From a paper:
The complexes of wild type and Glu186Asp mutant HAs with [name] showed similar features and indicate only weak binding. In both structures, there was clear electron density for only Sia-1, the 2-6-linkage atoms, and two or three additional atoms of Gal-2. The 186 mutants differed from the ‘wild type’ and the 134 mutants in their ability to bind to α2-6-sialyl sequences. A significant change relative to the ‘wild-type’ [name] was observed in the binding of the Glu186Asp mutants to α2-6-sialyl sequences in all three types of binding assay. Binding was, however, still less intense than to α2-3-sialyl analogs and relatively poor compared to that of the human H3 [name] X31. This was also reflected by the poor resolution of moieties other than the terminal sialic acid in the HA(Glu186Asp)–[name] complex. Glu186 is highly conserved, with no substitutions detected among avian or human [name] viruses except A/Vietnam/CL1/2004. In contrast, the Glu186Asp substitution was not detected in the sequence of the clinical specimen and therefore most likely emerged during isolation in MDCK cells, although the presence in the clinical specimen of a minority population below the detection limit of the pyrosequencing method and subsequent selection in cell culture cannot be ruled out. At any rate, our observations indicate that α2-6-sialyl binding [name] variants can emerge during replication in mammalian cells containing these receptors.
Residue numbers in the entry:
A (entry chain E), C (entry chain E), F (entry chain E): 5 to 325
B (entry chain F), D (entry chain F), E (entry chain F): 1 to 158
Write the structure that this text describes.
């Protein structure tokens, strides 16, 4: 008669690693690393992303005519932009403090676009001839829909003195610009006056822009340049413009309705028609794992990201052959 | 393993014990079979479950990468930003792989320890009443029926 | 006759945590986390902090008349400034490279203020009429005590050519400024001349400032703006000013006597009349613990900061009920 | 615990031994009482003291946060600065909480180990001279007076 | 040590055993000498070698410092850059010194464990055939020649 | 008759540390920290470093006449520059976006210098009188060999209109500059015209530089200043210059042949005539150790750097006395 002490074996083929030994077969184990995604861009808690496609954040905000899809956009959860969007800045130039603006966007979920200076408002200047072949719409020479390229009226450019004060409760994103012509003659043809300025002022802003005239390489069949500036106009504050030429005037300005968690993510993927609680630039994650190895940049309720190929905890014991 | 029981003096596990992690096999005139030891199995379940929960919870405060953009003349800070984000992700990948490696080793040794403690408990009761065979088994001197057998498993033998 | 092996129990109620088990009662334990502070701002090794109260680093250095308390300050251990100090920049404007200057301050314990260009020195210009209602002192319109608002003398503003060379052994913080008026008429009234400049030069500096004229929001009943610049004047080096209007001239400049560990900390707390060896923005720390969880930003001989609520090491063994 | 002595085969500690961490209880015709084992207690004190000192010292090179200010158009680097400082403080909070968790477990097991080693030392001396009771105690075959008792504690029995 | 063998009940190592890490000494009428136990020595060699390799490999993903320059008016970011690089180097210095400290302790305990398991294996075979002396040695009851001696080392005694 | 279980001792004196105990003597151990270097700067995989000695990256690229050693340099593995090189910017001034350029250099192993605008090409201007005593070569007043100080020809400075388009496949580093004189008279003497400009343009660049005239401290016997600018000219793109004075024109521009891992390291050491696979600013490393404590900044196949004095793993067991 015999009694023995012993322990569980089973048919388990699961392996775990230890410092001393690798590939130890255990009766039971727990994988804690999520390795799968769906490969799609999805809604985040039901709320659709703003997917730009070919348009850039610049192309969208300024109102590139090819970015008509985004004239009026609903609340977004997060933004998606390609590595190199074709529809950016159709008339060549620069966007001043662009990265700081993209950064402001990561803390904004909803814009509401409102008219601040109507196109019909310009009396002493021509507002409808400020177009270019660099920004074409339906075959015809057009321009950034949210700013106005102002030109001389019957060979005269009177000094502009315009003021807007933001009644709105919200904060206001005001965009404007300046045209840099390539020679002294184009200056005359567009604006009449030879040495010009644009002065912008708020309670905090104290700006004076002066056009830089120089011949340069034809980017998109164009040697002229546009330089776009922006500000955040606080409530109960006024923005004061003053210019005698080269002024790209604000028509529309954005109200910032909502401040919420958001990011601009870089992806070549299109909309997937899915919903998720965790989104990466490569696809969505649906798991209860503590870890994932999909991509560093996520949004939502996500597992922690590690660079591992495998994280498996032993729970049971050394399995016998 | 450190405690010498699992794949040590007890050469292999038991396919026929599905009841628990550790237990007994008995063999006498009436027959033979397996009984899980409920106490030490349940202690083992609690221990391993608390560990896994502690591991998960201590890992939920990792670095979260944020998208940040820089123009063409901000190369130095774009690079600083990159080496910082990669730097933290390497620290946390290391922390996680090492914690798993170390605790796996402690989990296997915990099971070994549990088996050895259970074996020693039985050894202390049997005393001179049985021959310690050397392989996990004890061979009785007098006949030992099912309720004699139940007695050892209970902690009531003598 | 019987002999037994056994171990210590006691009445201890102290608990420690392990990976496997939580709240294990042990016979002895060692708490290593300091959880308490006194809630006061105190001296650091006997040496009092510079506590600004309502004044800002800008308000202090430029000499806002409401910051008279800080005309002459002793050696400080560290500096304390509120989140939003009321007495900053009484005449509205900007402080150029302000953050880089605050950064320089964290490595400075003592300033000695010395006159570089006397108020009595201005011959061709009026030095006593450069005041404003935005900076009031004892009911009367005053101005930043360390710079001089220079105006035309009997309807004439002659070009200024001033040089200072720093004999002092030490390094010298030189402050100056420029006035931005809101219209062409105010330019004439203050300075006579219409298009002006301020040029500043040292061995390393090569500056030319030009006033930006624009109408803007009345901040503190004022539409004009002041823009303040600074430099560090090395020993045996000269600073050369040249201006024909809009010049806010240095009267006093700071000698940097001492370079030592310091910080500017943000606190709404006032002086506490205590001494300490470790100071946080929330209060002082007095412990021999290796760790504390009070606040990240400390000065002195401090325990390491962790985000923990509890760090307790077992020293004794599992205590039996 | 791993070594099966503390709250294992020795069910509970002794309120009546204030003398040290581990030791003996004896019981005979002359009386009964507790004697601390000075050697193994002192080894335990050194071990635990060195550990605590090693723990403190290895932790004295943590990240120190520095106040840094940025204007309204330096949001990206203010954020970089923030995520960096928070990043290091999370790494060091993790390092400290985990070191404490792991070493607490090793300290409790060290005491268990010490008790088991002391028990085994006594077991090896008593041999067949005493009945191993199963609970930390040995019952002598012949009468064992105080100096017989002192002999076991000394390491001189036979 | 935790397992009580090395510098415990076996007081010291053997200068005269150059053959392996653990083994036997025998003494009888024919003579005396040392034989390494090849199995447990080789297991120990594998274990310690894999550990050292795991340690090296887990450490090959450290932070690499990069030279970066800043002008006189970029003091804040030069300082950020400095505290970041020093920050990661402190984390990795800590990680490396602590990993070495902890694993050294586990290596010494592994050898202790190996010695104790080998001792217990021999104890289980000898049974009542020999007096367990208390110091690592067993004293036989009947005469035990070289092939009797070879038998214990082999695992074939009885 | 007796059989015993026992373990290895030896004459080993090697010690290891544990959490519980320090200086434990072990039979065998493994040191994993490299503590030695050779104290020399060496080649990296056979490939020699660019060792500037007394010259700076600025002095080298602009062509300081004292940096003739580096008129034509082969492929380098890495660059070495002293803390404070004497031969930098011999005519005093500034190098615009200098640090960003040094940063670009860490990703460049080979430059090939090519002429873009020949010295013989200047018709309406004097090209051979643009020298200074601040930059002396062989006793005579010289100038930065890669740019041209252009002066009026027979009391006339005609507007310059120059274009270069980069045929080359490679990317091109174009350097230029502007002279800042110290008074109105020197402006006339050098350039004739009183108010001047330099306008530079590429497909991305839109620059207009205007000279800042002010009297300042004589750095290297000179009160005038040079301010040097640079750009990276893409292939198939043209750079358009336009100036009527103060123009320091490109003569030579660098082709970037090779992009590879590199660094600029700070060292006071000279060339050592050695080869290595791992280089630090203090010396070269030759070991198979996983760790080293030499210096943080290395290049090549290097062990990981730690701040330790000692890393020793136990392999054998506790050695008995
Ligand atoms: C362990 O197993 C994995 C996959 O089963 C295999 O790729 C790996 O090579 C094995 N590792 C070792 C060290 O044998
Ligand atoms: C630059 O020159 C190349 C070669 O002549 C030419 O093909 C290209 O169109 C030119 N581009 C510009 C902007 O001049
Ligand atoms: C342990 O005790 C603490 C305080 O005594 C209590 O807050 C906590 O809930 C307990 N934890 C567990 C897991 O029981
Ligand atoms: C801006 O407009 C609001 C509403 O008319 C007014 O109350 C406020 O005083 C104005 N402020 C300025 C600076 O014009
Ligand atoms: C250990 O030995 C080292 C060098 O042999 C010595 O410097 C150190 O003081 C010793 N440490 C202790 C704690 O004794
Ligand atoms: C500055 O003044 C000192 C003292 O007069 C003099 O020695 C030095 O040469 C001067 N340097 C300049 C640049 O004026």
């Amino acid at each position: 008669d015999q009694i023995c002490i012993g322990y569980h074996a089973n048919n388990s083929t699961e392996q775990v690693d230890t410092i001393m030994e690798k590939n130890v077969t255990v009766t039971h184990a727990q994988d804690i690393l999520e390795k799968k995604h769906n490969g799609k861009l999805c809604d985040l808690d039901g709320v659709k992303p703003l997917i730009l496609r070919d348009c850039s954040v610049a192309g969208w905000l300024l109102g590139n005519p090819m970015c008509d899809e985004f004239i009026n956009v609903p609340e977004w959860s997060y933004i998606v932009e390609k590595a190199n969007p074709v529809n950016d800045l159709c008339y060549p130039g620069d966007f001043n403090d662009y990265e700081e603006l993209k950064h402001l966007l990561s803390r904004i979920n909803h814009f509401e676009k409102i008219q601040i200076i109507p196109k019909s408002s310009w009396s002493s200047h021509e507002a409808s001839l400020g177009v270019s072949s660099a920004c074409p719409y339906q075959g015809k020479s057009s321009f950034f829909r949210n700013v106005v390229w102002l030109i001389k009226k019957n060979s005269t450019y009177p000094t502009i003195k315009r003021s807007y004060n933001n009644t709105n409760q919200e904060d206001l994103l005001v965009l404007w610009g300046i045209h840099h012509p390539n020679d002294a003659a184009d200056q005359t043809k567009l604006y009449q006056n030879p040495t010009t300025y644009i002065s912008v002022g708020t309670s905090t802003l104290n700006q004076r822009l002066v056009p830089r005239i120089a011949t340069r390489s034809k980017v998109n069949g164009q040697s002229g340049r546009m330089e776009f500036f922006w500000t955040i106009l606080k409530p109960n504050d006024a923005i004061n413009f003053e210019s005698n030429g080269n002024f790209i005037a604000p028509e529309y300005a954005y109200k910032i309705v909502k401040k919420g968690d958001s990011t601009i993510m870089k992806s070549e993927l299109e909309y997937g028609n899915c919903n998720t609680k965790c989104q990466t630039p490569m696809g969505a994650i649906n798991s209860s794992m503590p870890f994932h190895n999909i991509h560093p940049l996520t949004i939502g309720e996500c597992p922690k990201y590690v660079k591992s190929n495998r994280l498996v905890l032993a729970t049971g014991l050394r399995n016998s052959p | 393993g450190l405690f010498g029981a699992i794949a040590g003096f007890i050469e292999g596990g038991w396919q026929g014990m599905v009841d628990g992690w550790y237990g007994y096999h008995h063999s006498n005139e009436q027959g033979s079979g397996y009984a899980a030891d409920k106490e030490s199995t349940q202690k083992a379940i609690d221990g391993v479950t608390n560990k896994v929960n502690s591991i998960i919870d201590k890992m939920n405060t990792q670095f979260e990468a944020v998208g940040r953009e820089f123009n063409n003349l901000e190369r130095r800070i774009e690079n600083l930003n990159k080496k910082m984000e990669d730097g933290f992700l390497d620290v946390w990948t290391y922390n996680a792989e090492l914690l798993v490696l170390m605790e796996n080793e402690r989990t296997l040794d915990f099971h070994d320890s549990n088996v050895k403690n259970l074996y020693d408990k039985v050894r202390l009761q049997l005393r001179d009443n049985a021959k310690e065979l050397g392989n996990g088994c004890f061979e009785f001197y007098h006949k030992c029926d099912n309720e004699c057998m139940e007695s050892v498993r209970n902690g009531t033998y003598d």
